[PDB]
Amino acid sequence: AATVVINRRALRHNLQRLRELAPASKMVAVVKANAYGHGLLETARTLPDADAFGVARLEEALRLRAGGITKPVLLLEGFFDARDLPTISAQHFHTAVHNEEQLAALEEASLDEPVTVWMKLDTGMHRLGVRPEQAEAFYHRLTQCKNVRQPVNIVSHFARADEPKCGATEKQLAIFNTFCEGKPGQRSIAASGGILLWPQSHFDWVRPGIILYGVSPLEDRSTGADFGCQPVMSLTSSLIAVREHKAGEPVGYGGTWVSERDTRLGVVAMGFGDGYPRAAPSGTPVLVNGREVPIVGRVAMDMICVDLGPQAQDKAGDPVILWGEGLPVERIAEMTKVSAYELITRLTSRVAMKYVD
Amino acid sequence: QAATVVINRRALRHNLQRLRELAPASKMVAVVKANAYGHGLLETARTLPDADAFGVARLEEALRLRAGGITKPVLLLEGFFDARDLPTISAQHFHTAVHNEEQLAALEEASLDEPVTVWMKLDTGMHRLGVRPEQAEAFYHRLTQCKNVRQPVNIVSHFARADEPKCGATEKQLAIFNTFCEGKPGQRSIAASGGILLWPQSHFDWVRPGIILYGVSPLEDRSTGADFGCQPVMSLTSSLIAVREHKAGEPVGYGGTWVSERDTRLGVVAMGFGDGYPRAAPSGTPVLVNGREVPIVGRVAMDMICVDLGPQAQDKAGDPVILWGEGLPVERIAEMTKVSAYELITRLTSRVAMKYVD
Ligand SMILES: Cc1ncc(COP(=O)(O)O)c(CN[C@@H](C)P(=O)(O)O)c1O
Ligand SMILES: Cc1ncc(COP(=O)(O)O)c(CN[C@@H](C)P(=O)(O)O)c1O
C-alpha cells in the first residue's frame, strides 16, 4: 500500500544541477522535516557532496549525527535552550543566532570549543532575525565573544522570491547588502527561489530545499523539470477493489459525486491517514496501470475511489501512482490548491519508505 | 517543549465507558487505524483492554498490534489484499471483512489449520467497498459453505451520511441492511461514531467507535466531543522560540499576506506543516499562549507559526503553546480552518513527540 519511493539518482543529479546554476556558491542541502518527506537520514547519506545540511531544530541535527552523518549541520532557527550549547559545540553544529537569549547564552557560556554562528537578519519576512536598527550592536557583540568562532557569518531569507514582478526581493537584498558592507563573514540569503530566479542573490552559500527534491518552488505551474531537476519522490499504492457501479449512484461521504453512467470504480489503499490531501476534489488525477483516471467522491482516511470506466480490466492488486512518473506533484498541488511543499512533507508514518538507484 | 502530542489516557478510558453507556447492549470495536487517529496505535490499544476488539484499516496495522503484545480480536475493516495472507490471519486470529470475489475465492481454495471469523461487507449506499444487494445473497451463501470460515458469517456495513440527521440516506441504508440480515444468524454491525451518537436503532450487536472515542465530534455542526460527554484525548502543544518587535504597515510571512495595523510584538511557535499543522490555517486562527488566545498572522510555514501577542505583551521565548487541547477544542480549529477534524488529528508527521499522561 502507501509507499514513498525515493530516487537516489535524481537527488544526486539535482544537487549537481544546482551547483551548475550557482557555481561559485557552497550548498546547504535543506533536509528539515524528514527531508521534506523524503527521509532525513537517507537523504543526507545520498548526498555526501553537500557542503552542509540545514535543519529547523537541534533534535533533527542530533538525529543526523546519531545515524553517522559527520557533515556540518546548520541549525536554521538556532537553539532553544542555553544548556544546548555544550552539545552544539562538541557536535560541531553551526548555529543561527537571532535573539537576545541566544546571544547572552553565548557570552556567558564556557565551552570547550568556539561555535560557528550565522547571525540572522530580518530583512523583510518578519519571522526570525534581528531587525536592522538592532543589528550593528547585536553583530558587534558576536564578534567580541570567545565562544564564537570568528568570523561571524550572516544569513537571511526571502519572503517573496517566487514573485519576480513584486520588488520585495530587491528591497530585502538592499537591506542585506547594506548590512554586509565591510564585514568579513560568509553571506547567505537564497533558497530554491533565489537560486533559480535571482543570480545576484547567490553570494557564498545557497540553501536549496524544495528544488533539491525536484519540485518547483513557484506557483505558476512550473515543475522541477522546468529547471532541469528530476522529481525525487513517487507516492504509490495499489487497487484493493474494482467494483460495478450504476448511473445516478453517489460515492463516498456526503454523496458528493454522482455517476452519470454505469461504470467501474477502483479503490486505492491510500488516504489522508497516509498523508494524501483530503482537500483533493473529484476529478483529481491518479494513475492506474499508467493511465490517468479521476478521483471520485471525497478522499477518506485510508481509501480513495477512482472512476475506471464500465468495461475496464484493472484489478485489485494493480499499481497506482498518486504522484511520480507521468504525474508531477505540482499538478496535484494545482488541482488540490495545496502547496507542493505541504503535499510532499505532510505525510504520516504509515507510508513505507523505499529507496531506489 | 517542542512539537508534542499529549495523549490523556484517562480521557480515553472514560470515552469507551461513556460510549458503552450510550450503546448498552452493544460490543465495541475500538477503531485505532492510522496510528489511532494520530494518538498512537499500540499505546491506544494498551489503554483500552476493556474494548471487545480493535478495528484497523490494513493487515500491517493488525500485525503491529500483535507485535506489541496485544492479543484481543482484531478486525480487518478492509479485509486482506493477498490470498497468501490467510494463513497469518488464521493463526493470529484476526477477523476479516470480505468484500470481493478475490477474497471469497481465496478462502474457498485455501487449506488453513483453523477457520477464520468473517464479517461480510455489504454495500448499502456508500459505494466504496462491499458486495451490492443484487449479488450479496449468493456471495453470503458461499461464505456459509466455506470450511475455512467460522460459522455463523457476520455482516457489516458503514454509513455515508450519518452526520446529516435531517437527510434520508441513513434510513435507506438501514432498510437495505435490515432486509439482508432478516433471518440470518451471525452478528450485525453498521454504526460508528455518527451512528452511535445519533441513530440508536442502528446499534445492533457491534458498534465501531472511531473519532468520538478520541473525544472529538464526528459532526461539522459546531459540536465538540464534550457535547456527547466524551473528553478530548489529544492536545497538540509546543513552545515559543521568539518574541519580536514589529511595526505598523509591516507584513508577516511568505507573500506578505498579513499586515499589522499597529506596532506590536510577534511570537514564533515551534510548529508547522512539517509537524502536521495545516498550512490552510488563515490569519486569525486561535492559538493559546500562556493559556490565552492569540491569532495566527501570516502563513503557516513548515516549522514555524507566527502569532500576534500585542505591543507590551510579556510572553517570552520558551513559554508553552497549545494548538488544540484544554481550552481550545480541535473542532474549533477544524471550523476556523475548514479542515475536517478527522484529518486534523490524524495527518500529523513523525516529527511530533508522543507523550502519554495519567
Ligand atoms: C532559512 C531557510 N533556508 C532555506 C530553506 C529552504 O527553502 P526552499 O525549500 O524554499 O528552498 C528554508 C525553508 N523554507 C520553507 C520550507 P519554510 O519557511 O516553510 O520552513 C528556510 O527556512
Ligand atoms: C468501516 C468503518 N467503521 C468505523 C469507522 C469509524 O468511523 P468514525 O471515526 O466516524 O467513528 C470507519 C472510519 N471511517 C472514516 C474515518 P474514513 O472512511 O475516512 O476512513 C470505518 O471505515
Residue numbers in the entry:
A (entry chain A): 3 to 359
B (entry chain B): 2 to 359
What does the primary publication say about this deposited structure?
In this study, we have addressed these questions by focusing on the two PLP-dependent enzymes alanine racemase (ALR) and cystathionine β-lyase (CBL). E. coli CBL is a homotetramer that catalyzes the formation of l-homocysteine from l-cystathionine. We have demonstrated that two non-homologous specialized enzymes from E. coli are as little as one mutation away from being physiologically relevant replacements for each other.
The inhibitor, (R)-1-aminoethylphosphonic acid (l-Ala-P), is a phosphonate analogue of l-Ala that is a substrate for the transaldimination reaction, in which the Schiff base linkage between Lys-34 and PLP in the active site of the resting enzyme is displaced by the amino group of the incoming substrate. Thus, l-Ala-P forms a stable external aldimine with PLP in the ALR active site. Binding of l-Ala-P to ALR(Y274F) did not induce any significant conformational changes in the dimer (root-mean-square deviation = 0.16 Å over 715 Cα atoms), although we also note that the ligand-bound structure was generated by soaking. Formation of the external aldimine tilts the plane of the PLP pyridine ring by ∼10° toward Tyr-255′. Tyr-255′ is positioned to act as the catalytic base, with a distance of 3.3 Å from its side chain hydroxyl group to Cα of the substrate. The side chain amino group of the catalytic acid, Lys-34, is 4.1 Å from Cα. There was clear electron density for the l-isomer but not the d-isomer of the inhibitor, confirming that there had been no observable racemization of l-Ala-P. The orientation of l-Ala-P in the active site of our ALR structure illuminates the role of the Y274F mutation in enhancing CBL activity. To test this hypothesis, a cystathionine-PLP adduct was built and docked into the active site of ALR(Y274F) using GOLD. In this docked model, the Cα atoms of l-Ala-P and cystathionine overlay, and the distal carboxylate of cystathionine is perfectly positioned to engage in a salt bridge with the side chain of Arg-280′.
